[PDB]
From a paper:
[name] is a ligand-operated temperature sensor with poorly defined pharmacology. Here, we combine calcium imaging and patch-clamp electrophysiology with cryo-electron microscopy (cryo-EM) to explore how [name] activity is modulated by the phytocannabinoid Δ9-tetrahydrocannabiorcol (C16) and by probenecid. As expected from the previous studies, the channel architecture displays the classical domain-swapped homotetrameric assembly of TRP channels. Each subunit harbors a transmembrane domain of six transmembrane segments (S1–S6) with S1–S4 forming a separate voltage sensing-like domain, while S5-S6 and the intervening pore helix (PH) form the pore domain that lines the ion-conducting pathway.
As expected, the two structures obtained in the presence of C16 displayed relatively open configurations compared to TRPV2apo-1, in agreement with a functional response to the ligand. Although the binding for probenecid remains elusive, C16 associates within the vanilloid pocket. We tentatively assigned this density to C16 because of the associated structural changes in the channel pore region, and because of the lack of a similar density in other maps of available [name] structures. However, the size and shape of the density does not completely match C16, which may relate to the limited resolution and the C16 occupancy. Consistent with C16 binding, residues H521 and Y525 that line the C16 pocket rotate considerably between TRPV2apo-1 and our two structures to provide space for the compound. Notably, no indication of a ligand at the CBD site is present in our structures obtained from C16-treated sample. The putative C16 binding is at a different position than that proposed for CBD in TRPV2CBD, which however is a closed structure and retains a lipid in the vanilloid pocket. Finally, an important observation from the comparisons of the structures determined is that C16 affects [name] beyond the local binding pocket, and thereby significantly increasing the pore width along the conduction pathway (and see below). Taken together, these data indicate that D536 is a crucial residue involved in the interaction of [name] with C16, and of importance for a proper synergistic interaction between the C16 binding site and a separate binding site for probenecid.
Residue numbers in the entry:
A (entry chain A): 76 to 415, 429 to 561, 589 to 693, 701 to 719
B (entry chain D): 258 to 415, 429 to 561, 589 to 693, 701 to 719
Write the structure that this text describes.
């Protein structure tokens, strides 16, 4: 403030006038411990000096040396903003780095600068306002801004070296920060890939003993797992299949073994495998991930073959479960139909139905206990798990009502019948039904069901109330008129309101108005639904079917609730020295073979 | 014109003339001169729908000696984030005939829904909506309570007598209140209804409903039974009016609904064609019936009821000339099927050509109109005087407005 307004003389000799004015305030030599730090609410003189950028070479060396030669105890840089307003710990070294001024950061780190202390830019809360997230570290800020020179100076700085494995308040590292800011646009993906590879190579060169890609944040996610969870497909794919030739061979994930022609036999790397590892990449993609791209991530080269092998192994149990459910449904239907030697058969049938209901209820309760969050995230492709549970519950209740000698068991049981048959459709995904993209289109358009339902309910329960109000001088019930109109709408009945009612000229007008309004509403429904199929071709039913199969095999690898399967065997392919559990994949690419020579 | 070359030429000439006028005559401000209609160049550009020049004038910045004649002053930029300080004189408060008022009401170009999404207006309207959503939902709740009272009173009217009399009195009072409010609105906004009836028809319906219910109450005091029909209408219409409030609790409204609501410009032609068909065939049929079916209205109603699936034809019985009645009925049915199919194809042709995925802009325009109307307060007690306060005066002496922008693409392109 005061120093800033006394430093308005840019040209001339501004290095000496401020020194002459300041000294030690000329009257308070020992009172500068706390009376000096009151010029602003956090914006000190050094920040203004490094933020000026008025000339090509700003006068910053000599004032810093002047303050260094007389003051040694009052470190200005270590002080940070304790107020949420005007940043929350934003040191001047961040400004020096991000203004692309190597000289400023160099001079700052000559004396007294502490790198990797704190930034507190934005982690989860508090510091907000559409702020910039860069990992809240000076090295991470330099890396995210594509400044190779600053990073190179920081890593092997003779004065104070910056550790490359440092973690911020959120637990993220520099690689995590690069993953977070990644975007699917080609230029952002190229920039982040280049920075990632450069940082990996530099860390290998300087520190060959530490592995930077095995460090997990507070959530327990490595950069690969974090990229899979956040839906950043480009960087995830690049990390999944990367190969380096030369001295950088060890830090590679794909090792090409031998290529004959257009065929290549590569040896991909694991640690993205379901078995022997909790929170695998596939488990995160199937359940924890919520981005729309999750169906395009299961088609990548190693995951595709891994899931295909697992499905080919477990299709037998899939169809065995199908057969058991079908037999149970036949028994249930026969028992329900033939219940208006035989008494023993009926009692046995009822006992078996109760046992099956209990079994299904316990299985679905276990599934819901294990996968609470998946239902909330992805109810679109997991609603069957609800229906089964519901059906089971219903049938159990029916059996109880049969033992209380009340007739009310008959309705519920009937419901438990019909719903059960619908559940058989769940098994259409095992015997090679793609499912059609259009079916997905309708199943996703039901996000608009609530609005149209509200509009139709308003129409129906306004017109019914008006009609029953005219009827008074039976039709006393709102329910009667509402049901009559609804039955007319779906073609299940006739209106029959035109008879008598005295005021026969107004009842007619109300009925025509209702009919025209509901026709308009249905036409609006149809046009809103159909608009998607003529714009988004999205011929990717194969990917969605693969995702469904992946979810199924992931769920059924655990085994039944009453007897957990044999422990997940890590065995996918024998260890290769390249000491790493690998996986052999064969690719064929005629286009690549023809382009090359 | 909105063509790129015309916009570039006019922008270059505008900036050159502004700089030259500043150099030669630094005391006069050329952008504060209004024509006979009272419109400055910015207001005129907003009214005429010239989006390109309007946007350029709205956000222009000059570095050097031409700094004072600028409207946007960039304060500080960290990374892809920039904190700019836009200029007012396009604000609703403290100024009549503002830019936003002209865009919402006086403008008639199709581009008006794309002008409210510009950088300062977007944030200004968002702040105003966030302030006034509470009153919006309070009005919603009051209307809902009134509708429940009206429905209960109508249903339970075939200690209790006092309750019924009180209910009738409250219904009369509510009808009078709504009638007065809508009359005030129509007095203030005569031209807007004519220009933009497409997005302002609800203001009519409300008024109509109010009028109807008031009349019904009068007919109840004359001891005539004819109050019962009208009142019933005043019931059903009222419920439909609740749909007006679906725009406050975050319903976008869907682009398709706009497609149907705009296709009703073709309603008149199809209605004329169908009326000609119906009243030709009905006259022919009643002419054959003579040797009852004496009424044109009877035959027309019978055919219309058959068309919408509400009844049966039943003309095939007797009539002696039973071979001609059949031919007329088949001809009518085929013609009306062709007409309905033509209607459907004409309606659906738009959704397969014009994707126009801009429902957000239309919803923003609806919210802007709503907040502009409700900032004035109720008719019986005008709100507190429009406070000019949007942000403190900045020397840059100008009422400014602080906006924060984030642009990853611009940050990545530059270095």
């Amino acid at each position: 403030d005061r120093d800033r307004l006394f430093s308005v003389v840019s040209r001339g000799v501004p290095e000496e006038l401020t020194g002459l004015l300041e000294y030690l305030r000329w009257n308070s030599k020992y009172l500068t411990d706390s009376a000096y730090t009151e010029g602003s609410t956090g914006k000190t003189c050094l920040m203004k000096a490094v933020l000026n950028l008025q000339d090509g070479v700003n006068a910053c060396i000599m004032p810093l040396l002047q303050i260094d030669k007389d003051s040694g105890n009052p470190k200005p840089l270590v002080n940070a903003q304790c107020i949420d307003e005007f940043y929350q710990g934003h040191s001047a070294l961040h400004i020096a780095i991000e203004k692309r001024s190597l000289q400023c950061v160099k001079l700052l780190v000559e004396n007294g600068a502490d790198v990797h202390l704190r930034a507190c830019g934005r982690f989860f809360q508090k510091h907000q306002g559409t702020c910039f997230y860069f990992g809240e570290l000076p090295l991470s800020l330099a890396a995210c801004t594509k400044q190779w020179d600053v990073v190179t100076y920081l890593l092997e700085n003779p004065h104070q070296p910056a550790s490359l494995e440092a973690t911020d308040s959120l637990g993220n590292t520099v690689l995590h920060a690069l993953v977070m800011i990644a975007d699917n646009s080609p230029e952002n993906s190229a920039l982040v890939i280049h920075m990632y590879d450069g940082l990996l190579q530099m860390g290998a060169r300087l520190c060959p003993t530490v592995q930077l890609e095995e460090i997990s944040n507070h959530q327990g996610l490595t950069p690969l797992k974090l990229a899979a969870k956040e839906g950043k497909i480009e960087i995830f794919r690049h990390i999944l299949q990367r190969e380096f030739s030369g001295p950088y061979q060890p830090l590679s994930r794909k090792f090409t073994e031998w290529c004959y022609g257009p065929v290549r036999v590569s040896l991909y790397d694991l640690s993205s495998v379901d078995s022997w590892e909790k929170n695998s990449v596939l488990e995160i993609i199937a359940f924890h991930c919520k981005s729309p791209n999750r169906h395009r991530m299961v088609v990548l080269e190693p995951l595709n073959k891994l899931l295909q092998e697992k499905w080919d192994r477990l299709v037998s149990r899939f169809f065995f479960n199908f057969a058991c459910y079908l037999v149970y449904m036949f028994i249930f239907t026969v028992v329900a139909y033939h219940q208006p030697f035989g008494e023993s058969m009926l009692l046995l049938g009822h006992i078996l139905i109760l046992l099956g209901g209990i079994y299904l209820l316990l299985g679905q309760l276990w599934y819901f206990w294990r996968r609470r969050l998946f239902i909330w995230i992805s109810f679109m492709d997991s609603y069957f798990e609800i229906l089964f549970l519901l059906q089971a519950l219903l049938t159990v209740l029916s059996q109880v009502l049969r033992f209380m000698e009340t007739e009310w068991y008959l309705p519920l049981l009937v419901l438990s019948l019909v719903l059960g048959w619908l559940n058989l459709l769940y098994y259409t995904r095992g015997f090679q039904h793609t499912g059609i993209y259009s079916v997905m289109i309708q199943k996703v358009i039901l996000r608009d069901l609530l609005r149209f339902l509200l509009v139709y309910l308003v129409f129906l329960f306004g017109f019914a109330v008006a009609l029953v109000s005219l009827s008074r001088e039976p039709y006393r019930s709102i329910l009667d008129a509402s049901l009559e109109l609804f039955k007319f709408t779906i073609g299940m009945g006739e209106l029959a309101f035109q008879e008598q009612l005295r005021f026969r000229g107004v009842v007619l007008l109300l009925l025509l108005a209702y009919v025209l309004l509901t026709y308009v509403l249905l036409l609006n429904m149809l046009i809103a639904l159909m608009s998607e199929t003529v714009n988004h071709v999205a011929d990717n039913s194969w990917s969605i079917w693969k995702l469904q199969k992946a979810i199924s095999v992931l769920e059924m690898e655990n085994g039944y609730w009453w007897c957990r399967r044999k422990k997940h065997r890590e065995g996918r392919l024998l260890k290769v020295g390249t000491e790493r559990w690998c996986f052999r994949v064969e690719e064929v690419n005629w286009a690549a073979w023809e382009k090359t020579l």
